[PDB]
Amino acid sequence: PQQIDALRTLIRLGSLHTPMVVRTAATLRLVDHILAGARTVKALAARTDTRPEALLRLIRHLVAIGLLEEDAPGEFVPTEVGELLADDHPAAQRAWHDLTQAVARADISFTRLPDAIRTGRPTYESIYGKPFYEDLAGRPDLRASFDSLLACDQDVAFDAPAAAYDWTNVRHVLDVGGGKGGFAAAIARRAPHVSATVLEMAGTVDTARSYLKDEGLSDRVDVVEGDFFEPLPRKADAIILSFVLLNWPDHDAVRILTRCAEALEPGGRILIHERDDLHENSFNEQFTELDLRMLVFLGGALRTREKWDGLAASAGLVVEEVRQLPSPTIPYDLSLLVLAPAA
Amino acid sequence: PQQIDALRTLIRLGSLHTPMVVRTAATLRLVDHILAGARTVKALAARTDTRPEALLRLIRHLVAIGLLEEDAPGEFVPTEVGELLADDHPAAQRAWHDLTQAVARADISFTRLPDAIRTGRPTYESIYGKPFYEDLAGRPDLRASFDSLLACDQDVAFDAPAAAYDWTNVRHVLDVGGGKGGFAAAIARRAPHVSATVLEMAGTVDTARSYLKDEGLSDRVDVVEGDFFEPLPRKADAIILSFVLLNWPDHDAVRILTRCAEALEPGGRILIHERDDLHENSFNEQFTELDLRMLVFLGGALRTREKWDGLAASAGLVVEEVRQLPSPTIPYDLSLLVLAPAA
Ligand SMILES: Nc1ncnc2c1ncn2[C@@H]1O[C@H](CSCC[C@H](N)C(=O)O)[C@@H](O)[C@H]1O
Ligand SMILES: Nc1ncnc2c1ncn2[C@@H]1O[C@H](CSCC[C@H](N)C(=O)O)[C@@H](O)[C@H]1O
Ligand SMILES: Cc1cc(=O)oc2cc(O)ccc12
Ligand SMILES: Cc1cc(=O)oc2cc(O)ccc12
Numbered sequence: 049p050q051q052i053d054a055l056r057t058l059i060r061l062g063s064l065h066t067p068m069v070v071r072t073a074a075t076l077r078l079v080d081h082i083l084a085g086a087r088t089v090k091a092l093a094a095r096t097d098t099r100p101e102a103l104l105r106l107i108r109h110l111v112a113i114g115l116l117e118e119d120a121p122g123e124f125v126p127t128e129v130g131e132l133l134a135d136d137h138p139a140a141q142r143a144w145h146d147l148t149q150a151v152a153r154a155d156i157s158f159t160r161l162p163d164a165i166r167t168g169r170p171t172y173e174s175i176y177g178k179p180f181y182e183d184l185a186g187r188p189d190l191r192a193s194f195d196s197l198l199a200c201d202q203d204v205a206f207d208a209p210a211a212a213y214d215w216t217n218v219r220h221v222l223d224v225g226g227g228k229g230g231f232a233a234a235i236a237r238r239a240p241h242v243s244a245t246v247l248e249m250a251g252t253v254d255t256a257r258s259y260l261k262d263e264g265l266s267d268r269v270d271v272v273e274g275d276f277f278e279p280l281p282r283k284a285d286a287i288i289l290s291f292v293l294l295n296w297p298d299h300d301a302v303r304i305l306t307r308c309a310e311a312l313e314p315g316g317r318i319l320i321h322e323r324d325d326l327h328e329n330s331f332n333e334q335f336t337e338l339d340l341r342m343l344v345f346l347g348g349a350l351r352t353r354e355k356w357d358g359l360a361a362s363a364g365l366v367v368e369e370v371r372q373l374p375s376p377t378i379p380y381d382l383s384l385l386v387l388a389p390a391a
Numbered sequence: 392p393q394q395i396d397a398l399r400t401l402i403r404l405g406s407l408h409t410p411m412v413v414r415t416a417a418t419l420r421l422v423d424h425i426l427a428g429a430r431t432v433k434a435l436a437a438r439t440d441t442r443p444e445a446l447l448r449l450i451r452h453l454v455a456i457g458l459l460e461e462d463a464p465g466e467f468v469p470t471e472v473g474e475l476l477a478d479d480h481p482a483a484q485r486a487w488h489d490l491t492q493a494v495a496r497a498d499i500s501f502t503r504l505p506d507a508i509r510t511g512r513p514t515y516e517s518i519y520g521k522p523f524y525e526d527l528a529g530r531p532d533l534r535a536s537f538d539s540l541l542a543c544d545q546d547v548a549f550d551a552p553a554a555a556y557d558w559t560n561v562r563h564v565l566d567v568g569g570g571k572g573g574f575a576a577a578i579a580r581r582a583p584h585v586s587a588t589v590l591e592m593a594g595t596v597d598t599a600r601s602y603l604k605d606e607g608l609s610d611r612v613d614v615v616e617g618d619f620f621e622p623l624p625r626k627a628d629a630i631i632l633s634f635v636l637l638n639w640p641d642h643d644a645v646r647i648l649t650r651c652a653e654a655l656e657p658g659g660r661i662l663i664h665e666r667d668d669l670h671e672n673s674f675n676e677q678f679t680e681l682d683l684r685m686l687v688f689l690g691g692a693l694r695t696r697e698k699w700d701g702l703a704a705s706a707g708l709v710v711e712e713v714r715q716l717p718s719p720t721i722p723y724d725l726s727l728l729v730l731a732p733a734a
Contacts, residue, residue, distance in 0.1 A: 062417075068501040105683060132394070
């Protein structure tokens with residue numbers, strides 16, 4: 049028959065057990081345990097304290113989808129795909145699929161995706177009892193997990209956007225929602241004359257300060273606890289919004305942008321580090337995974353290039369320049385948008 | 392880079408939003424509405440009462456994964472894969488992905504798959520408040536949805552297993568857990584001398600009786616409400632277990648098989664309609680989807696050919712014959728296992 053391939057494709061795409069099998073394997077650290085020598089069901093069950101027959105049934109699906117393969121009778125090893133769940137693999141896919149860590153936990157919000165399409169509003173609170181950042185505020189362990197997921201490569205992940213801007217006429221930088229300070233730190237190393245301030249929430253400010261202390265940068269990058277919907281704590285020649293605005297619906301993103309514009313020194317610029325696909329180029333899996341996560345986690349949104357033009361104008365700004373940022377590590381297209389005050 | 396394809400494969404397999412996007416589209420009947428003429432976001436939002444920008448964001452992922460394509464600017468149509476979500480397509484994939492119907496609703500149990508691997512026990516009750524069949528018993532609408540999902544092709548789905556057995560020396564058939572009576576009805580049509588009894592739960596017995604009345608078979612197939620862990624209501628030359636034993640862990644499946652053996656007339660046989668892959672042949676997506684659903688819904692299990700040999704022996708039975716059943720419609724390998732009393 050001719051629709052057999054189509055039927056197989058639809059069933060795979062619609063399968064909820066397959067991603068949960070991947071995330072279960074990640075959460076149980078199965079691939080790590082296999083690499084450390086536990087190749088049989090009976091050894092792996094003892095290492096994970098799972099029930100042996102139930103673990104075999106999980107492993108069977110892991111083989112079926114090509115993450116594991118049966119080497120010898122009853123002995124399993126990771127494939128090239130499965131090896132990506134090793135804890136120290138540079139793409140960090142084990143942690144990003146670990147159900148006890150903040151993002152895969154938040155992905156359970158997708159079980160109520162019909163509600164989010166009807167309302168345009170997040171479903172996270174309906175599952176976990178508080179909106180996303182309030183939940184993180186009440187669970188410092190999840191706050192720390194989220195911060196480390198985003199900041200994993202922060203020793204070098206922010207080098208490209210910091211190198212993509214000319215800091216010669218910048219004296220003070222304000223990184224609004226600046227995470228653990230990785231972006232501020234990368235700017236400080238590249239532009240030694242610059243002083244920087246990180247504005248962040250409780251909890252995150254402490255690991256930011258602690259990170260900057262380890263880096264020897266406390267004298268050049270300070271950390272302020274605060275709320276970026278309130279007046280910003282100081283003015284700056286460059287104000288950074290790195291993976292901030294996508295957390296927020298249009299009206300909140302305009303309020304944040306407005307606060308930033310109000311805090312700009314003369315000649316200053318606002319720097320947005322995010323995606324900016326043209327609408328025509330946005331029908332791709334990288335854009336939609338992040339965009340739909342922002343919907344169900346937060347009620348935020350990724351913005352196409354067209355929408356950035358509109359959002360800037362609403363905040364009194366113009367898009368002066370968009371710099372494409374190289375990710376020759378793993379292809380994830382990101383941009384640095386440079387916004388200036390409108391005429 | 393060389394691990395780009397591997398990384399892409401892992402991320403797709405681990406994506407929870409993609410199957411929820413498919414199920415959301417199925418639940419909103421999006422493909423039906425498109426085929427009826429609503430091709431734009433603005434028309435489809437009004438037909439589904441969703442928020443237009445949020446619906447566009449869903450559609451974007453549906454295009455990205457190849458269920459929809461943008462025909463004209465802002466107009467979307469289903470692909471060959473997407474057309475399978477039309478409500479009347481014979482593979483019934485819309486209903487099987489509809490979150491308001493019993494199976495896709497039960498698939499939310501997979502969000503707690505780590506618990507099921509640790510315990511070997513279902514997670515359905517922890518989500519919905521009662522174990523699977525008790526939940527169906529308290530929600531007659533879900534009971535009816537489940538019964539119709541399984542019985543969809545019952546006018547012809549049971550023709551092959553009914554044709555695969557020689558009914559010449561059978562006088563009475565008992566179909567234990569016989570659903571809406573489709574299998575009993577197919578036997579009655581092929582073997583007019585046979586009389587049959589369907590044993591089923593509350594609710595299901597009424598739609599079974601109603602189905603058999605529509606078929607003109609009330610005089611030949613009767614329906615008894617009861618519990619197949621209790622003594623069976625009568626003896627039979629052939630006792631049918633069609634998609635029953637996989638609902639149950641080994642010790643419960645032995646109890647059901649034992650009840651059946653105790654009710655067999657001399658010379659009688661027990662007929663099992665299920666999968667029976669050799670363990671070596673079971674590392675495939677058809678086996679694992681059903682097997683893992685039985686785990687999280689019910690604590691049941693699919694049994695490999697080796698396990699059937701063991702289960703039969705535990706119940707005092709031998710596997711006399713296994714007949715492979717043709718499904719040239721869509722390839723789903725099923726078998727008819729014929730069990731006889733052990734020597
Ligand atoms: N009202 C608020 N005031 C200040 N910071 C906030 C805030 N709401 C959210 N945030 C911060 O916004 C950040 C978005 S995550 C991005 C972190 C970092 N800029 C990076 O690129 O990786 C979070 O760290 C969160 O703590
Ligand atoms: N304790 C019990 N006693 C009798 N029937 C039961 C039962 N527990 C579950 N069942 C029935 O077992 C059936 C399994 S579903 C299979 C239905 C049908 N034989 C078919 O092949 O499609 C359900 O219809 C359910 O109502
Ligand atoms: C880059 C990226 C990918 C993703 O899948 O989820 C995210 C969530 C965030 O809060 C910030 C960034 C990302
Ligand atoms: C044949 C089949 C496929 C599936 O995916 O789920 C099922 C669930 C049941 O209770 C009975 C049969 C099936």
